[PDB]
RNA sequence: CCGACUUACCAACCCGAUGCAAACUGCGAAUACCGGAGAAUGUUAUCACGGGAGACACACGGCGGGUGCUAACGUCCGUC
RNA sequence: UCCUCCUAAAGAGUAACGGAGGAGCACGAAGGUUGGCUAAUCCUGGUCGGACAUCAGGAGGUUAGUGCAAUGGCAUAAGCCAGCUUGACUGCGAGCGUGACGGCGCGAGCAGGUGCGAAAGCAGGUCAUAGUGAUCCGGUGGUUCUGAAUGGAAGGGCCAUC
RNA sequence: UGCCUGGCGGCCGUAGCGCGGUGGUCCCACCUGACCCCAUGCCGAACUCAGAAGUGAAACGCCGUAGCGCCGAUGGUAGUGUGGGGUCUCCCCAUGCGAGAGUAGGGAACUGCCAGGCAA
RNA sequence: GGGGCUGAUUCUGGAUUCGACGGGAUUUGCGAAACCCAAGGUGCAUGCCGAGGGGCGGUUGGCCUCGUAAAAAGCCGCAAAAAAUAGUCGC
């Protein structure tokens, strides 16, 4: 397993995000999809959820879950977040290495107007 | 051949549950990590849990492995 | 003779003997002698109690000892003053609570076993009695 | 990609006709070999390891891989973190042609060949063997080399039982004497 | 899988000297002409 | 004890120094650490001193 | 000599059962001590600052123990 | 003298020529950060090699490790490797803990100045608790702060330190 | 709305194991393809990208399963706050507090939100 | 009765009795002990029985032997078992 073993790496960031009580920016990487959510500091309610799974968002590309398709929803989520007036999140690695698509998801979220 | 010992360190709890203390007031002196940090509680160099801000000291147990927590609710 | 093989501490505290037996009733054999008084038994007392009790049947059956000294008890030398260290070990007693079955025998007639432990009762210091195998 | 194309179609239907695999993901696949040359005696001198790696040096892509001691042993005169052995983890695609360099042409190069055992398993069904020397490989010419250096060669397949790993060796003409 | 420490490679074309040819990618060096093949290995008799 | 005390004086214009201990028997070369200088209020290198 | 059979038993690790521990605890009291709320009662019983001291040889009785021989009007600590 | 367990009677504390052990150092890396990872010990198989190397697969579960003794803890690892650094920084410090006192400990946060990461974040030493001596005296560097009629000096003060 | 899945949590062993079944439309995992992004004290095992032909084997999810772990009274029992007593190294009685383990039993969870797919 | 020191030249760590003998394997060649497959040999055999055993009595609880009964092997005590098994010196 590489998934449940990844979780304990994410916990140190996940402990830190609630210990200092900041709104986080979570990721989840699938072979053919990418995911992006914004979750409230209370730790049980998700405010902004914009992923490629939705049928009205996937059809903008041929293959979802690659770098340009990951940036397609990275731009959208902060637009939905800033439409709620959100101006502070910290990017959560969610155990994923900040090199590839989950960096490219974070690049578009930087491009949408949010600061992290 | 024996009798050599040390002077005790006065460890243990300094403030009990429900007590309201100001920021920087030491909650529990301990060697290991018998009480872990919840909210508004930081571990020092020697795991000295201190009150980070105003409020009342609350003792609870949470976590997957049932780790005790000192937390502060700002009252 | 009984003595702890490869024990941990040479010297331990004197301690009190309070409470009742944490060993209830007849488990191993079929007939047992249960101590009634409260006190302690030296390891010298046990073997001479084991010797004379086994003397009655001379080989027959087996005798289940339910106890063990497991306690070094010290004594200062003769004609030395108080303190000056802790006294060294001499002999090993067993802290005995009331209602503790000391020795268990199986493989004898009922009446022969009666004097088999009664002769073992005279060797042992504390007043004690006989019990049968318990039912459930 | 020589024998994998023989594995791709002919062996696959040979497997499901042998053990009735309902799925094409339960037929075992070879995944790696462990070409490990644990010389050992290089504890005192470096070049007993360095040329051993250099005698190992002609199988996989590049330079030869060093290993380290697991802990410190008095009898084998070693301390913790000691460069002692040299190994190979030949997993993936570059390893499939090596079998034809080993299981076909290095087989008739053994001094007084008789056969290899069929009762050597890790419990799960992956075969481990150790060649007594290294000279049977084509890369060694007995000109510049100096040793009869032996090396454990463990093949690890995805066999769910011991007979399947025997069978997955048997599906590629293994010499079961 | 990783870079640069797996015991060296070089493609050669080989041919055993008994009328049986085994010409696969190898790692020997320049080339090598073999002597005995699997088909002439006496395990059959 | 063998870690005899040394001095880490600054390449800056001050005469100030950090003071610490090194094992000059085992690590023969001098120490080079860019600490904070208080007088310059800047980061400058420190070499060993006696 | 082979060399099989047998044996009180010497007899591991695993299973089940049986007891002991101040320096064993997966279990866990009484009371103890701290914080908050409240009411009755008490010549402020609470604490602070200043003037003045004496005292720092304790003793037995009770329980908690160390030690001793669970011997001592013994010794050493807790607490009344 | 200092440190750890017990005696100690579940707050802390608590003695005897009571029971047991450790310290008078080690580390510029065994420090800081980020990234990454998880042991003990078995049996299965395998060239020398067998009981012990190296290698593979499973059991197993931290019985491992944690500079060093015990205790407390630690995988979110405090264990382990890699990468880049010197936060082993200075001026403070609300706040408490603790001893008669001297003294010691913990501390977010503020100013300046740095490293890591992209980022919130972390770092003013080591997982913690021993690894140490008050003052006087004088040594060394920096500072006009003072410097006896004055210009300076000497000598002191201060700050760093021996 | 329901059935599912995925993501993030509350509680965290009635919540966990072992074993008996199921799922690939969707999702998820396996997967294929790897110069280049990037990875490496080694070989696209992990990490990384590009894709999605095959697959539900395995993982995972749910259903079954007490073969175990686990929660577990009631009464009795041990101890003890005081108050007295005894043949006072240990007990009794008055009241007050009340286990540990064991016993009948319970147990293979529940829970909050958000987005997709399928049925209404 | 107690305390200290000394306790194999190392007094703080890396034995290499240079050697037959004792343990382990390695390598070699193949042996019912390092072995099985009835097939290449190959027709009249094996076990239960009965039987007695080199000069003696026995002796594998089984062996050279006995086609239903008087002769034969390894070996036990028997016994061809050895003896200044280094010197040099005495009467």
Curated annotation (Swiss-Prot), chain B:
GO cellular component terms, semicolon-separated: cytoplasm; cytosolic large ribosomal subunit
Offer one example of a GO biological process linked to this entry: positive regulation of ribosome biogenesis
User: What keywords are annotated for this sequence in UniProt?
Assistant: Ribonucleoprotein, Ribosomal protein, RNA-binding, rRNA-binding, tRNA-binding
GO MF terms, alphabetically ordered: ribosome binding; rRNA binding; structural constituent of ribosome; tRNA binding
Assembly notes: Part of the 50S ribosomal subunit. Cross-links to the 23S rRNA. Cross-links to the A and P site tRNAs.
Describe the family membership recorded for this protein in Swiss-Prot or TrEMBL.
Belongs to the bacterial ribosomal protein bL27 family.
By what name is this protein known? Large ribosomal subunit protein bL27
Q: What gene name is given for the protein in this entry?
A: rpmA
From Swiss-Prot, chain C:
PTM note: Is hydroxylated on Arg-81 by RoxA. The modification is nearly suppressed when E.coli is grown in anoxia.
Give yes or no: UniProt keyword Transport: no
Question: Amino-acid biosynthesis as a keyword?
Answer: no
GO-annotated biological processes:
cytoplasmic translation; ribosomal large subunit assembly
Question: Where on the chain is N-methylmethionine found, per UniProt?
Answer: 1
Q: Where is the signal peptide?
A: none
Task: Name the keywords, alphabetized.
Answer: Hydroxylation, Methylation, Ribonucleoprotein, Ribosomal protein, RNA-binding, rRNA-binding, tRNA-binding
Q: Name one Pfam family in it.
A: Ribosomal_L16
Question: Into which family does the record put it?
Answer: Belongs to the universal ribosomal protein uL16 family.
Q: How does it assemble?
A: Part of the 50S ribosomal subunit. Cross-links to the A and P site tRNAs. Interacts with assembly factor DarP(YjgA).
> What protein is this chain from?
Large ribosomal subunit protein uL16
